[PDB]
């Protein structure tokens, strides 16, 4: 199949405004949220129907208990960081863990943390070590690496457990995750630029580009973002500016899910 | 569904090497623990393995093969104090511990100078029991339970006289029957040929 | 400090009686567990508490309830004791749960026996037997034997005291008690222990030996209706003096 | 502390055609921290029945959201998205341009 990824996020806020949760945890398969938990509901809930239909209530009961424990642990870790940064006010602590099963069968795994939305600690499961960005992170790094068993544990989880969960979730939601809706592609003009617009496609992974007389023009092209249309499909665009003094053969190229497409502007 | 298996009991000799096996079938794997539990006491943590290979820690080493679903706890240079139950436990995909029933490790002491004998202890004025002591035999000797309902025979027990650096096996038999005699108390056991029976 | 502290160490219960097992940990741990250990099977989780302020059922929650009173304490409640709840109960704690490689720290354990009727609870009869003169002359050592017999349930602690101080060197006590009638299901128990000393130590006439058995039985609130004495928690002992003879 | 200002993009679910029912989207992404207020506007007035996705997380630690409402585009009606954030001294309005 195509490349797929599973990743879990945590967010902790030290002094949140009234109502806003102190802790939020969301999991994703590719772009799809699958799980959610926060300090307000204190329940772990599915965020995809195919997760709700395939995981029995004892699963959500168990992970509700785990997330309540991890919520308290995250609060303690954020308290430690902010005191050691000597920081006042509200600050954020984030975590991301997960893995990719690539098309060719190889795998990747990652685990990292952020403070105030910037890299803080990054795990290297091949050297079994943490990369620290400053001296507050360095202190944490020393503590986490003194426990060699915890490093081995995370390496095993990234390389074995994460990949096995992902394969399981891929089967559950295969009607969603493994489908293909090809893009509808058009070109129009909007001093003057050609816009190549695609929409109605899934998966969101798409490559659009312009070529001039057969050569690519990377430095001259404006790339739009891949945006959700709201119905489970996506849209994207790419524009290029027209030479008013000399004609050229411009063509839009779109690659999506193994099919290549060319729109030559006449 | 989820299953862990280890032998019920193992017997080895003092100073030898023993390898305690643990196989597991689980949905997911987040590590394997070994715990030691002395009789009547709490389990205490021994080792943890989550990747493949062999970890050393004093006289104990623990091995793990994730593909075979197999671990062993290796005890070298066995001492009497290693007599305990050894519990293996596996953390599954939801971080829940599945526990083995445990392996009871029995250690036979190395008796330097066997002197097997059956002694009659002195009567107590406060008891109608006659008491016999089978003692100082080599560790290969087994003590059978009594086959007479009014005769009671305990299993063998290893005592250590620390000051004299001396170990000995012993078993006790008693009864209040009139025809009870230490010459015949351990008749249902296979006892050494040279067992000393002092005169009545 | 102390680690994991659970109480009581032993308890006899009548069917239908209530009981609370206490457990405290002073290691600043977040996760606490209640296990039961039964012969021939692995530890089974009853209830657990991943962190302060949350609890959930384990593998065998029926007949039990728990309360995570605070970060330190996690109590186990038997509201209506049943014979199947006769077991050894262990409380444990860990720093976190789901933090991968963290191990469990166990308490000393609580031995529970639930009986339909208390009329088969008996304290031990305890007697000491002095060394054989044949042993002394043949080995230059002297083995005393202590016999605690006829007790039920198996809630006993045996110790030797030489000249007023408890001793451990030269002592072997049966690791498991003997069923006096192995067929009967509620058979009374027997337990033996030896203390071996040098002949010279035994032949000192001012050396005093005592075997003592702490029995955990009934308490003030347990109703007693039998003709014999109420089998309360008590210490039963027997003594012997050295023989210069 | 590096605070990151929202990127705001307003667009229709389908290529818009006057008189044909559609969905107006406001996708707000790349901001940090996570507190944010978003409104859809019709001729300057706030639209009452407006939906939005749950707060979402990007691997560069920023956040994103999709606000949307059903609508029928006409020649006369101008649509906009108005966003406020800690990085914005005053709300930023972005007009729907088709
Ligand atoms: Na219950």
Of C50, C56, C101, the CB nearest to A149: C101
Could you give the CA distance from residue C221 to residue C13 in angstroms, rounded to a whole number? 11
Q: Could you give all domains of chain D from N- to C-terminal order, each with its CATH number?
A: 1-98 (2.60.40.10)
State whether C133 and C240 are in the same domain: yes
Rounded to 5 degrees, what are φ and ψ at C232? -75, 160
State whether C69 and C158 are in the same domain: no
Q: Does A265 touch chain D (CB under 8 A)?
A: no
Distance C46 CA to ligand 1 centre (A): 8
Could you give the CA distance from residue C141 to residue B126 in angstroms, rounded to a whole number? 24
CB B142 within 8 A of CB B189: yes
Largest CA distance in chain B: 68
State whether B129 and B89 are in the same domain: no
Residue A265 structure tokens: 């502007």
How do the domains of chain A map onto residue ranges? 2-179, 180-265
State whether B105 and B127 are in the same domain: no
Distance B4 CA to ligand 1 centre (A): 26
Could you give the CA distance from residue C224 to residue C228 in angstroms, rounded to a whole number? 10
Boundary of a domain, candidates C93, C116, C139: C116
C167 Rama class: left (phi>0) / alpha (psi -120 to 50) / beta: beta
Closest by CA position to C12, among listed C217, C243, C222, C231: C217
Distance A55 CA to ligand 1 centre (A): 24
CB A139 within 8 A of CB A84: yes
State whether C39 and C128 are in the same domain: no
In CATH, A180-265 is 2.60.40.10: yes
Of D11, D15, D54, the CB nearest to A33: D54
State whether C128 and C105 are in the same domain: no
Give domain A2-179's CATH superfamily: MHC class I-like antigen recognition-like (3.30.500.10)
Answer yes or no: do B160 and C170 touch at CB < 8 A.
yes
Could you give the CA distance from residue A92 to residue D55 in angstroms, rounded to a whole number? 15
State whether C165 and C60 are in the same domain: no
Boundary of a domain, candidates B109, B142, B172: B109
Q: How many CA atoms lie within 13 A of C55 on its CB side?
A: 21
A57 Rama class: left (phi>0) / alpha (psi -120 to 50) / beta: alpha
State whether C29 and C88 are in the same domain: yes
Boundary of a domain, candidates B91, B109, B127: B109
Of B31, B152, B170, the CB nearest to C194: B170
Q: Per-residue DSSP letters for A102-153?
A: -TTS-EEEEEEEEETTEEEEEEETTTTEEEESSHHHHHHHHHHHH-HHHHHH
State whether B97 and B154 are in the same domain: no
Closest by CA position to A149, among listed B81, B57, D18, C167: B57
3-state secondary structure at position A80: helix
State whether C103 and C124 are in the same domain: no
**Which chains border B (3 or more CB–CB pairs < 8 Å)?**
A, C
Q: Measured between CA atoms, how close is B28 to chain A, in angstroms? A: 7
**Total count of domains within chain B:** 2
User: Is D2 exposed, middle or buried, given 0-12, 13-18 or 19+ CB atoms closer than 10 A?
Assistant: exposed
Residue B106 structure tokens: 């029995």
Token look-up 């609508």 returns D71
State whether C99 and C162 are in the same domain: no
State whether B100 and B119 are in the same domain: no
Boundary of a domain, candidates C71, C100, C116: C116
End-to-end CA distance of chain D: 37
Of A20, A26, A114, the CB nearest to D35: A20
State whether B153 and B190 are in the same domain: yes
Q: Does D49 touch chain A (CB under 8 A)?
A: no
Distance A97 CA to ligand 1 centre (A): 35
Strand C10-14 versus strand C110-115 pairing type: parallel
State whether C215 and C157 are in the same domain: yes
Answer yes or no: do B50 and A66 touch at CB < 8 A.
no
Distance C216 CA to ligand 1 centre (A): 28
**β partners of residue C78:** C19, C64
Cα dihedral: C245, C132, C170, C150 (round 10): -120
3-state secondary structure at position C112: strand
Chain C residues touching A149 at Cβ < 8 A: 100-101
Quote the Cα angle for D18-D22-D27, to 5°: 120
State whether B191 and B103 are in the same domain: no
State whether B99 and B156 are in the same domain: no
State whether C99 and C7 are in the same domain: yes
Q: Does A154 touch chain C (CB under 8 A)?
A: yes
A213 Rama class: left (phi>0) / alpha (psi -120 to 50) / beta: left
Q: How was this structure determined?
A: X-ray
State whether B18 and B28 are in the same domain: yes
Which structural domain range is residue C105 located in? 1-116
State whether B193 and B120 are in the same domain: yes
Q: Give residues whose Cβ lies within 5 Å of ion ligand 1.
A: C 61
For residue A153, say whether it is annotated as part of any ligand binding site: yes
CB C79 within 8 A of CB C65: yes
Which structural domain range is residue B123 located in? 110-200
Of B100, B133, B160, the CB nearest to C42: B100
Boundary of a domain, candidates B89, B109, B129: B109
Q: Does A62 touch chain B (CB under 8 A)?
A: yes
Distance C64 CA to ligand 1 centre (A): 4
Q: Measured between CA atoms, how close is A230 to chain D, in angstroms? A: 7
Chain B residues touching C174 at Cβ < 8 A: 154-155, 157
Q: Does A18 touch chain D (CB under 8 A)?
A: no
Chain A residues touching B30 at Cβ < 8 A: 153, 156-157, 161
Could you give the CA distance from residue B99 to residue C61 in angstroms, rounded to a whole number? 17
């Amino acid at each position: 199949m195509r490349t797929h990824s599973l990743r879990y996020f945590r967010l902790g806020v030290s002094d949140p405004i009234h109502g806003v949760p102190e802790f939020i945890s969301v999991g994703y398969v590719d772009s799809h949220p699958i799980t959610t938990y926060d300090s307000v509901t204190r329940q772990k809930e599915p965020r995809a129907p195919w997760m709700a239909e395939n995981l029995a209530p004892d699963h959500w009961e168990r992970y509700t208990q785990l997330l309540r424990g991890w919520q308290q642990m995250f609060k303690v870790e954020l308290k430690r960081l902010q005191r050691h940064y000597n920081h006042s006010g509200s600050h954020t602590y984030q975590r991301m863990i997960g893995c990719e099963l690539l098309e060719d069968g190889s795998t990747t795994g990652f685990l990292q943390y952020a403070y105030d939305g910037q890299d803080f600690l990054i795990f290297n499961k091949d050297t079994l070590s943490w990369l620290a960005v400053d001296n507050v992170a360095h202190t944490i790094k020393q503590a986490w690496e003194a426990n060699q068993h915890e490093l081995l544990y995370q390496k095993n989880w990234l390389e074995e457990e994460c990949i096995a969960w992902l394969k399981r979730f891929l089967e559950y939601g295969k009607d969603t995750l493994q489908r293909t809706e090809p893009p509808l592609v058009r070109v129009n003009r909007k001093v003057t630029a050609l816009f190549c617009k695609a929409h109605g496609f899934y998966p969101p992974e798409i490559y659009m580009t312009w070529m001039k007389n057969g050569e690519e023009i990377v430095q001259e092209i404006d790339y739009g973002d891949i945006l959700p249309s709201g119905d489970g499909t996506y849209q994207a665009w790419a524009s290029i500016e027209l030479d008013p003094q000399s004609s050229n053969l411009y063509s839009c190229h779109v690659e999506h899910s193994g099919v290549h497409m060319v729109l030559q502007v006449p | 569904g989820q299953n862990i298996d280890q032998p019920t009991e193992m017997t080895a000799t003092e100073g030898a090497i023993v390898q305690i096996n643990c196989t597991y079938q689980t949905s997911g794997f987040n590590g394997l623990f070994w715990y030691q539990q002395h009789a009547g006491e709490a389990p205490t943590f021994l080792s943890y393995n989550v990747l493949d290979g062999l970890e050393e820690k004093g006289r104990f080493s623990s091995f793990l093969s994730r593909s075979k679903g197999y671990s062993y706890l290796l005890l070298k240079e066995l001492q009497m104090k290693d007599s305990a139950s050894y519990l293996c436990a596996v953390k599954d995909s939801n971080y829940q511990l599945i526990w083995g029933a445990g392996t009871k490790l029995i250690i036979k002491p190395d008796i330097q100078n066997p002197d097997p004998a059956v002694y009659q202890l002195r009567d107590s004025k406060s008891s109608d029991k006659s008491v016999c002591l089978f003692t100082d035999f080599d560790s290969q000797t087994n003590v059978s339970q009594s086959k007479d309902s009014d005769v009671y025979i305990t299993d063998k027990c290893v005592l250590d006289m620390r000051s004299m650096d001396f170990k000995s096996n012993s078993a006790v038999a008693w009864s209040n029957k009139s025809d009870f005699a230490c010459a015949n108390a351990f008749n249902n056991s296979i006892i050494p040929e040279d067992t000393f029976f002092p005169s009545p | 400090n102390a680690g994991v502290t659970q109480t009581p160490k032993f308890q006899v219960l009548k069917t239908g009686q209530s009981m609370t097992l206490q457990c405290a940990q002073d290691m600043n741990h977040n996760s606490m567990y209640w296990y039961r250990q039964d012969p021939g099977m692995g530890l089974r989780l009853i209830y657990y508490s991943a962190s302060e302020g949350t609890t959930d059922k384990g593998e065998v929650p029926n007949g039990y309830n728990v309360s995570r009173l605070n970060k330190r304490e996690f109590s186990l409640r038997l509201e209506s004791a049943a014979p199947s709840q006769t077991s050894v109960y262990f409380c444990a704690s860990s720093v976190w749960t789901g933090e991968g490689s963290g191990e469990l720290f166990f308490g000393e354990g609580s031995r529970l026996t639930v009986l339909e009727d208390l009329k088969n609870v008996f304290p031990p009869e305890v007697a000491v037997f002095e060394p054989s003169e044949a042993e002394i002359s043949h080995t230059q050592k002297a083995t005393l034997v202590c016999l605690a017999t006829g007790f039920y349930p198996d809630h006993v602690e045996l110790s030797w005291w030489v000249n007023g101080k408890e001793v451990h060197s030269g002592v072997c006590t049966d690791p498991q008690p003997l069923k006096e009638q192995p067929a009967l299901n509620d058979s009374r128990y027997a337990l033996s222990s030896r203390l071996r000393v040098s002949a010279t130590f035994w032949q000192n006439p001012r050396n005093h030996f005592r075997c003592q058995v702490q029995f955990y039985g009934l308490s003030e609130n347990d109703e007693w209706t039998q003709d014999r004495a109420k089998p309360v928690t008590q210490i039963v002992s027997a003594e012997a003096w050295g023989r210069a003879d | 502390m590096i605070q990151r200002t929202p990127k705001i993009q307003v667009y229709s679910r389908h290529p818009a055609e006057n008189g044909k029912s559609n969905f107006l989207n406001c996708y707000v992404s790349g901001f940090h921290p996570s507190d944010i207020e978003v409104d859809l506007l019709k001729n300057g007035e706030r639209i009452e029945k407006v939906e939005h996705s749950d707060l979402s997380f990007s691997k560069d630690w920023s956040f994103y959201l999709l606000y949307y409402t059903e609508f029928t585009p006409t020649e006369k009606d101008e649509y906009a998205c108005r966003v406020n954030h800690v990085t914005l001294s005053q709300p930023k309005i972005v007009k729907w341009d088709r």
